[PDB]
Ligand binder design. Structure first.
Ligand SMILES: *[C@@H]1O[C@H](CO)[C@@H](O[C@@H]2O[C@H](CO)[C@@H](O)[C@H](O)[C@H]2NC(C)=O)[C@H](O)[C@H]1NC(C)=O
Lengths: 148, 647, 981, 49
């Protein structure tokens, strides 16, 4: 119900709650999506870059890797050491409770992130509709349902 | 001339085994009689009945025990109030309307302590006896009423042995403070109630201890101008309070039950507590010139309330104390008659035994007593008797008098006073009394008395009673008849041969355990001839030692004036027969209580020391109704039991 | 002067309103008569009587004498008051209350209780021969010479306490004696053990008196420590066993973590493992252990089951004080819901013993709880929030709810319930169907302007009263109160939307859910409530509600509050009444994990409604078989333990987690649904990083010492200036400080009361209040006195908070002693203060032999050891923090710190010989450290205790002979890292 | 209408039982005052179905 049009134009920093909140991966078309993937700010906003700590679980072992995000409007160039990853937030809920990322590769994957603290259910459902539209029938992974 | 006398309790008690006596006279041939309790007024239903045989072997006297079963009575809207007592035989058939009560037995509520503080647990059990003083074994309902009149808990329990243990009542952490009431009742059949009280008070930590010690427990004429009061105070670490400020307010109080009091803002004297002790003197006369009163003739039996506030000087802390009331006493003595019915028998010396007690209701000895009397005969001619004087026997407290009055006297207005060598005339004890002559149309009177009553009758001894009748038709009386009652039941009855070679004759009565703690004796003879048979009767009240049927005794081994904490000790219980025993161990300081033998003889339907205005009144004041073909003229509306008169 | 008061008393001797004159004349040197009468509510006549007697009493008290004042207190204090039942002495519980079959003779032996009491033994025989009251026999248990000691409730570590006692001699003759103290390890005494318990110094007690006893001690270790006291006399020797409770410094703070175990994923996603990480909080008091308890219970209702069935206590809301009738009802809430579960689901076989006896016990405890509220009931069957206060519509409704639910298992007095319901509907229901409150009790603070706040509060009260009436209607089904229910239901239907808060929307939705569930407007309200739902996960693992509306506040809370749990509970119960089973599972999971060890939640209302939600859900769904192998183990440490949970036992006792490692609770393939709660208790030195919803200030003054504690409410966003709701002012008293209870009584007992209830519990003065103002400060003022002497007095805390919103709070430290300075401790009488803290080395001491500096460093006990330079000094509460720079690292046993990184040191402020100067270098070697996560990086803090070797280290070489000093210093510094001992 | 305004009453027969009357059928008696007094008076309330 309602209209799912929210946050126009899409700003990544706004979609990340200006680096004040942590977000969890709830849907992803990536078959290798890390279980219980959570991203939380690891530092202050210096220039266009921003430190982001990524926690996830392999088997029964919790792991954390440090990353740096380079934000340019809606685009995000994430990197750790030599590994680089290009993303673009293609949708952001009206209250910045959830957003839909598009990761670039030969077969571009689509992801849905939401506040670890929780989000307004109607907006969470709107992000879910956007992700189902972008995925267009592809198999979805649910990284948060992995006994986190 | 042939007569019959049926004796029953004044009132029938539902569920009680009521003993009905039948005594017939003039019959030489044996015959049977049916005594019956039936429904009123139709006699359609028979609550119970019994057959009694009357013969020479039987001396033509017999007894039958009837019982009104509770289940045989309807319930609720139109409950039974009356039943019919009926006697039927070959010779006669007579009935009478008898009232019934649904009060049967006794319910004693026993709580471990009388005062509780929050979070404490009240231990409570009920002792339940039936009308015959035996374990009732009836299921019992307890109700708890808080100081605001609310029924806040109810619990019922069945009774197996006569001792009913209830679960403990937990006092709430923040309860309604004040006077709580416990009400016991039976779940079925009966209207018996029991009642107990216990207070719930808020604990407040005291700073020090304050004690008030008056000069005496009573205020007489000697201390009406000065009454010494000593106020002490000490810290709870066993040291005397060095300096403090003492404020004392005085009031006049009507009775100790009512918390109302009239203060006296004139005697608010203030003093200093030094080294633990302070003292003041209260001028009663001067202070009671306020609030009217003025004289010592007033204030009598009223109380002096004392309030003291002590303010310790170092820490400024304050603690209060009070004496609830000191009774003002106008006379050191109180007078009361003992074993002297207020009824005259024309021709018989009339005895008066006065008794002197102090402010503690203790028999005072060596107290001279002066007796005055006015007499009124049938001609209304008043006569002032010559005063007599006795001295109180110090062995029994008794001061005895014997009075010889003219045969024509009808009313005796006698007054007794104390004659103490150190008391003013106001401070003497005085009591007035009126005695009316027994009325008989044949000038026929009976007077009984048993040697004498000191000491009290001990179970196992013997009661040597003297039976003196005064009448014409004397030497034609065949026999004497007697009924012995105790605790509202006719326990004995019979007949003794009259010796033609004396005026009086001793009837011997073995005093038994059935007669504890009190009994009543009714003796009567039948005047016969022409006109109509007449019953000439008299009765006496027998005070008997309070002796248990199954005596209980508890002892502590080892016996010592004081014990040490945690000491292992043995308690030895000994009873005459196999008996249940309910034990309790309470901190005596809670008492700063119950007596069963006195509350038990409320079932005695008799009143006074015996006697009566006529035969019917003699039977009535002894707690008896009777059925007779002889004259039965009684007073008006005489259906309820007598009420003990107060003065 | 006497006549000027005789007229007053005579004027109000028989006035109906007489006390208002009385407590008007009471002394109040802090407020004028008009300020005191401004709080009077009992009506207009009382204000004028109060004002008159207040003004006249104040005029007469000018230049009075103590005798005149006291005589005036005599005139007033007698004619106007009535009486109050109270007692100054305690009477111990009676004993031997038993019945025996006595076969003519029976002896029974026992032990007399430990008490000084004149006991009275009474026997009553019952037999077929009647009743026999035996002669009462006396038994006086008495001790003529005995010692007693007064040990305080708690003592803060480091405080020097004077323990006072008394020896009593009731003999008429004086005697010699000596008391000695038993030295325990943690308790530091100035003298030393001889052979090992103190010394016997012979004194004499005079006959029939007492003698004082004093022992000064200084606790160095936290916890309960046994101390014995021996009294010796020429006639014997007595030992008095005692216990001293030593408490840490700072504030206690308690956090909670919850996890639900669903191994087969019946109610949601599978949940077999969970890791509770060990994280050291920021301002943790040094050398204090982080305590944390682990509770694993069998069902969703398992925590409440364990709370009720285990009789070691227990209140599920111990952090909230007693006093209000609400507390007395909440005392019966858990027992009721346990009974409701056991009876409705027929689960009495859980008991291994006789279930009938257990049902008996719970029924009795339910009744016992039920009498507790009788005190708060008035003659007209209304209920008052505060004993003796005015009747409250709100509390009467709540009592009707709890009683109405309990009536199912313990039948209630129908006539009483009828009178209470009718008191509600006949007097305090308006024409529009709403209910109005009679008293000034404000249970909740709502947003909006004064008119909007009025609408909101009216809606809330109407829904609350409706819930109560519905819950108790079957006891007294009158047409009159059903009509009342219709009118109120209509008010709710027309006035709920548009909503002003998710809270009132939820409670209105639940109240209407108790009636006709087919009305269209009710369905609209339920839809609006669903629209506000928050979810964690997609598909959602959790579903909960925030009490603020989305269009007013879009931020999502990070931790739960009482309003959050209460809104979620109302919504859950509304959904259960609609049989909406697909929607509640994530809600049930959220409420279950928000629960707390003990069964309760944040405040009272959220607790009762959440317990009802969990219980009703547990009875509505199929009871699964319970069978798990639950293993709790540390990650990098040994396995703690494991237990097999079945329906036989699943309320197992908790277990304390001592080791400083991360915890792991795991289970294999199982059947059932268990709950795992962890309560972390820490002690913190500061409160600055906490949100304060009250301005606080507190001081001690000298009077012509008195505590003055003031608070003022900080309204939230869109909240009016009307002030807070039901509030609590909890003032911890310092060790050995005692409060004047008369001053507190005088502040609540009168018609001009400033506070509505007071109590003194465990060293705390707890006052309660209808409302704390926003416009101005409100101050409690009460005198204090020193009970026993205390040195190095640790500060105490002053906390005020909303009773129904404990999250709206403010905690502040204060001390009753001004005492500074702390320059030095002078020689001996000193080893106890300087016992457990570091001693600085002698400055430029050349006798330290370089090998003793290395052997001390290479000690396996010494964890870290390196050379630093101090940058800043700071004094925080009871401790001193030194900011230093890490120069050269010489040893690292445990975690590592970076070179030239910032390192913090901490020493107890009460330590002088470790005085460090800013800017100077020092060699510091010691044990242990604290690893904190500040901002986004690590930080290490090192305590300065005993066996911490510190030495001043100049950088240059112009220290005359200390040139050689630095030579050997640099000798050790060179040898340590080239060897690796 | 019926039990609109008729007083009701609670009383004690000679057996100790409590009985209520004054109340027409299909209604309930509501009694004011301390529940421990045997003699109480109140009014009738119409009761429902
Ligand atoms: C304090 O007194 C208690 C009681 O005497 C002591 O406890 C006893 O200690 C002895 C050994 O010293 C044990 O054999 C007993 O079993 C203990 N009894 C109990 C009930 O625990 C205690 O040791 C004393 N404490 C000190 C510090 O002296």
């Amino acid at each position: 119900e309602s209209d799912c049009t929210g946050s126009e134009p899409v700003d990544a920093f706004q979609a990340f709650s200006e680096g004040k909140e942590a977000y969890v991966l709830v849907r992803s078309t990536d078959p290798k999506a890390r279980d219980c993937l959570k991203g939380e700010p690891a530092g202050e906003k210096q220039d266009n870059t921003l430190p982001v700590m990524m926690t996830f679980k392999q088997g029964t072992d919790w792991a954390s890797t440090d990353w740096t995000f380079t934000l340019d409007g809606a685009k995000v160039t994430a990197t750790l050491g030599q590994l680089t990853q290009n993303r673009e937030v293609v949708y952001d809920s009206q209250s910045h409770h959830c957003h839909v990322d598009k990761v670039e590769k030969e077969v571009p994957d689509y992801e849905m992130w939401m506040l670890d603290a929780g989000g307004l259910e109607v907006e969470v459902e709107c992000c879910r509709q956007k992700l189902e539209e972008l995925a267009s029938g592809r198999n979805q992974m649910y990284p948060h349902l992995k006994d986190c | 001339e042939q007569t019959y006398v049926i004796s029953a309790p004044k009132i029938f008690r539902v569920g009680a085994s009521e003993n009905i006596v039948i005594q017939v006279y003039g019959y030489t041939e044996a015959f049977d009689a049916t005594i019956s309790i039936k429904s009123y007024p139709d006699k359609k239903f028979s609550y119970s009945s019994g057959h009694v045989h009357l013969s020479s072997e039987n001396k033509f006297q017999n007894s039958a025990i009837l019982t009104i079963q509770p289940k045989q009575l309807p319930g609720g809207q139109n409950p039974v109030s009356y039943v019919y007592l009926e006697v039927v035989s070959k010779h006669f058939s007579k009935s009478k309307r008898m009232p019934i009560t649904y009060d049967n037995g006794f319910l004693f509520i026993h709580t471990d302590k009388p005062v509780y503080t929050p979070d404490q647990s009240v231990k409570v059990r009920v002792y339940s006896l039936n009308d015959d003083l035996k374990p009732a074994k009836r299921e019992t309902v307890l109700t708890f009423i808080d100081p605001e009149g609310s029924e806040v808990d109810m619990v019922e329990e069945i009774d197996h042995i006569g001792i009913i243990s209830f679960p403990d009542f937990k006092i709430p952490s923040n309860p309604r403070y004040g006077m709580w009431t416990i009400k016991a009742k039976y779940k079925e059949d009966f209207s018996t109630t029991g009642t107990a009280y216990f207070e719930v008070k808020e604990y407040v930590l005291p700073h020090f201890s304050v004690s008030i010690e008056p000069e005496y427990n009573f205020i007489g004429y000697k201390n009406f101008k000065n009454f010494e009061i000593t106020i002490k105070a000490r810290y709870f670490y066993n040291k005397v309070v060095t300096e403090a400020d003492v404020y004392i307010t005085f009031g006049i109080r009507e009775d100790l039950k009512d918390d109302q009091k009239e203060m006296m803002q004139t005697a608010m004297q203030n003093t200093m507590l030094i080294n633990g002790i302070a003292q003041v003197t209260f001028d009663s006369e001067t202070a009671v010139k306020e609030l009217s009163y003025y004289s010592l003739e007033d204030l009598n039996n009223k109380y002096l309330y004392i309030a003291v506030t002590v303010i310790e000087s170092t820490g400024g802390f304050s603690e209060e104390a009070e004496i609830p009331g000191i009774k003002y006493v106008l006379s050191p003595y109180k007078l009361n008659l003992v074993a002297t019915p207020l009824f005259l028998k024309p021709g018989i010396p009339y005895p008066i035994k006065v008794q002197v007690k102090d402010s503690l209701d203790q028999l005072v000895g060596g107290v001279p007593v002066t007796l005055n009397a006015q007499t009124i005969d049938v001609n209304q001619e008043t006569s002032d008797l010559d005063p007599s004087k006795s001295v109180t026997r110090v062995d029994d407290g008794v001061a005895s008098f014997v009075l010889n009055l003219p045969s024509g006297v009808t009313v005796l207005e006698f007054n007794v006073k104390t004659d103490a060598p150190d008391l003013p005339e106001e401070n003497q004890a005085r009591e007035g009394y009126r005695a009316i002559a027994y009325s008989s149309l044949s000038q026929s009177y009976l007077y009984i008395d048993w040697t004498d009553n000191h000491k009290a009758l001990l179970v196992g001894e013997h009661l040597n009673i003297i039976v003196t009748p005064k009448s014409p038709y004397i030497d034609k009386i065949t026999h004497y008849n007697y009924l012995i009652l105790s605790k509202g039941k006719i326990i004995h009855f019979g007949t003794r041969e009259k010796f033609s070679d004396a005026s009086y004759q001793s009837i011997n009565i073995p005093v038994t355990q059935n007669m504890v703690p009190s009994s009543r004796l009714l003796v009567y003879y039948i005047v016969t001839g022409e006109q109509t048979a007449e019953l000439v009767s008299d009765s006496v009240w027998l005070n008997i030692e309070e002796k248990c049927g199954n005596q209980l005794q508890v002892h502590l081994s080892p016996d010592a004036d004081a014990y040490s904490p945690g000491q292992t000790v043995s308690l030895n219980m000994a009873t005459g027969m196999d008996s249940w025993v309910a034990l309790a161990a309470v901190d005596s300081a809670v008492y700063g209580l119950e007596r069963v033998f006195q509350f038990l003889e409320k079932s005695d339907l008799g009143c006074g020391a015996g006697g009566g205005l006529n035969n019917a009144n003699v039977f009535h004041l002894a707690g008896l109704t009777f059925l007779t073909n002889a004259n039965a003229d009684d007073s008006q509306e005489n259906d309820e039991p007598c009420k003990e008169i107060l003065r | 002067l006497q006549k000027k008061i005789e007229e007053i008393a005579a004027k109000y001797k028989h006035s109906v309103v007489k006390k208002c004159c009385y407590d008007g004349a009471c002394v109040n040197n802090d407020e004028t008569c008009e300020q005191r009468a401004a709080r009077i509510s009992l009506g207009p006549r009382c204000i004028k009587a109060f004002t008159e007697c207040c003004v006249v009493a104040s005029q007469l008290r000018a230049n009075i004498s103590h005798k005149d004042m006291q005589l005036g207190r005599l005139h007033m204090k007698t004619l106007l008051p009535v009486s109050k039942p109270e007692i100054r002495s305690y009477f111990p519980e009676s004993w031997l209350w038993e019945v025996h079959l006595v076969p003519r003779r029976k002896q029974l032996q026992f032990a007399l209780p430990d008490s000084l009491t004149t006991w009275e033994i009474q026997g009553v025989g019952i037999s077929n021969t009647g009743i026999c009251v035996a002669d009462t026999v006396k038994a006086k248990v008495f001790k003529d010479v005995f010692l007693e000691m007064n040990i305080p409730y708690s003592v803060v570590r480091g405080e020097q306490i004077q323990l006072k006692g008394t020896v009593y001699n009731y003999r008429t003759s004086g005697m010699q004696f000596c008391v000695k103290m038993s030295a325990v390890e943690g308790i530091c005494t100035s003298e030393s053990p001889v052979i090992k318990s103190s010394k016997c110094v012979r004194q004499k007690v005079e006959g029939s008196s007492s003698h004082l006893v004093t022992f000064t001690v200084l606790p160095l270790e936290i916890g309960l420590h046994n101390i014995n006291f021996s009294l010796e006399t020429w006639f014997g020797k007595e030992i008095l066993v005692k216990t001293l409770r030593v408490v840490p410094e700072g504030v206690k703070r308690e956090s909670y973590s919850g996890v639900t175990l669903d191994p087969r994923g019946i109610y949601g996603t599978i949940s077999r493992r969970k890791e509770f990480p060990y994280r050291i909080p920021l301002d943790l008091v040094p050398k204090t252990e982080i305590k944390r308890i682990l509770s694993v219970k069998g069902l969703l209702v398992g925590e409440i089951l364990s709370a009720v069935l285990s009789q070691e206590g227990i209140n599920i809301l111990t952090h909230l004080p007693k006093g209000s009738a609400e507390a007395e009802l909440m005392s019966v809430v858990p027992v009721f819901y346990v009974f409701h579960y056991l009876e409705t689901g027929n689960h009495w076989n859980i008991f291994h013993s006789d279930p009938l006896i257990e049902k008996q016990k719970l029924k009795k405890k339910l009744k016992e709880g039920m009498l507790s509220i009788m005190s708060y009931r008035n003659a007209d069957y209304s209920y008052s929030v505060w004993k003796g206060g005015s009747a409250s519509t709100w509390l009467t409704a709540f009592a009707l709810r709890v009683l109405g639910q309990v009536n199912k298992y313990v039948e209630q007095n129908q006539n009483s319930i009828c009178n209470s319901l009718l008191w509600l509907v006949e007097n305090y229901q308006l024409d529009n169907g709403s209910f109005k409150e009679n008293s000034q009790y404000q249970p909740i603070k709502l947003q909006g302007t004064l008119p909007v706040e009025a609408r909101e509060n009216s809606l809330y009260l109407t829904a609350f009263t409706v819930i109560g009436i519905r819950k108790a209607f079957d006891i007294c089904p009158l047409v009159k109160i059903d009509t009342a229910l219709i009118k109120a239901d209509n008010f709710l239907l027309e006035n709920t939307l548009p909503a002003q808060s998710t809270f009132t929307l939820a409670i209105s939705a639940y109240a209407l859910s108790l009636g006709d569930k087919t009305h269209p407007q009710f369905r609209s309200i339920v839809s609006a409530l669903k629209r506000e739902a928050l979810v964690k996960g997609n598909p959602p693992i959790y579903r909960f509600w925030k009490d603020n509306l989305q269009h007013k506040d879009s931020s999502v809370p990070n931790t739960g509050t009482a309003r959050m749990v209460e809104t979620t509970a109302y919504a859950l119960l509304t959904s259960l009444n609609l049989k909406d089973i697909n929607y509640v599972n994530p809600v049930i999971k959220w409420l279950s994990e928000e629960q707390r060890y003990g069964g309760g939640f944040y405040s009272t209302q959220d607790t009762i409604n959440a317990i009802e939600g969990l219980t009703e859900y547990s009875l509505l769904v199929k009871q699964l078989r319970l069978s798990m192998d639950i293993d709790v183990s540390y990650k990098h440490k040994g396995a703690l333990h494991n237990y097999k949970m079945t329906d036989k036992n699943f309320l197992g006792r908790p277990v304390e987690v001592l080791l400083n490692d991360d915890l792991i609770v795991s289970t294999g393939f199982g059947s059932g649904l268990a709950t795992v709660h962890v309560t972390t208790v820490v002690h913190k030195t500061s409160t600055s990083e906490e949100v304060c919803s009250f301005y606080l200030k507190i001081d001690t003054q000298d009077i012509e010492k008195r505590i003055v504690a003031c608070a003022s409410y900080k309204p939230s966003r869109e909240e009016s200036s009307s002030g807070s709701s039901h509030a609590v002012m909890d003032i911890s008293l310092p060790t050995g400080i005692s409060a004047n209870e008369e001053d507190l009584k005088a502040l609540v007992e009168g018609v001009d009361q400033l506070f509505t209830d007071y109590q003194i519990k465990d060293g705390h003065v707890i006052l309660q209040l209808n409302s704390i103002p926003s416009s101005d400060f409100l101050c409690v003022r009460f005198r204090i006195f020193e009970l026993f002497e205390v040195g190095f007095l640790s500060p105490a805390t002053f906390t005020v908070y909303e009773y129904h919103r404990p999250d709206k709070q403010c905690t502040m430290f204060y001390s009753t002693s001004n005492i500074k300075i702390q320059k030095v401790c002078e020689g001996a009488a000193c080893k106890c203060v300087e016992a457990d803290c570091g001693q600085m080395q002698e400055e430029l001491d050349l006798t330290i032999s370089a090998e003793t500096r290395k052997q001390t460093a290479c000690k396996p006990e010494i964890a870290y050891a390196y050379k630093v330079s101090i940058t800043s000094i700071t004094v925080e509460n009871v401790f001193v923090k030194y900011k230093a720079t890490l120069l050269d690292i010489y040893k690292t046993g445990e975690a590592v710190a970076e070179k030239d990184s910032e390192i913090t040191f901490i020493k107890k402020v009460t330590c002088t010989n470790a005085e460090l100067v800013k800017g100077r270098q020092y060699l510091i070697m010691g044990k242990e450290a604290l690893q904190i996560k500040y901002n986004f990086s690590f930080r290490y803090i090192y305590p300065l205790d005993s066996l911490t070797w510190i030495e001043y280290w100049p950088r240059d070489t112009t220290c005359s002979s200390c040139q050689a000093f630095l030579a050997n210093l640099d000798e050790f510094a060179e040898d340590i890292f080239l060897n690796g001992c | 209408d019926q039990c609109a305004n008729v007083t009701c009453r609670r009383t004690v027969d000679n057996r100790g039982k409590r009985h209520i009357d004054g109340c027409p059928p299909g209604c309930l008696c509501v009694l004011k005052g301390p529940d421990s007094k045997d003699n109480l008076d109140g009014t009738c309330y119409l009761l429902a179905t």
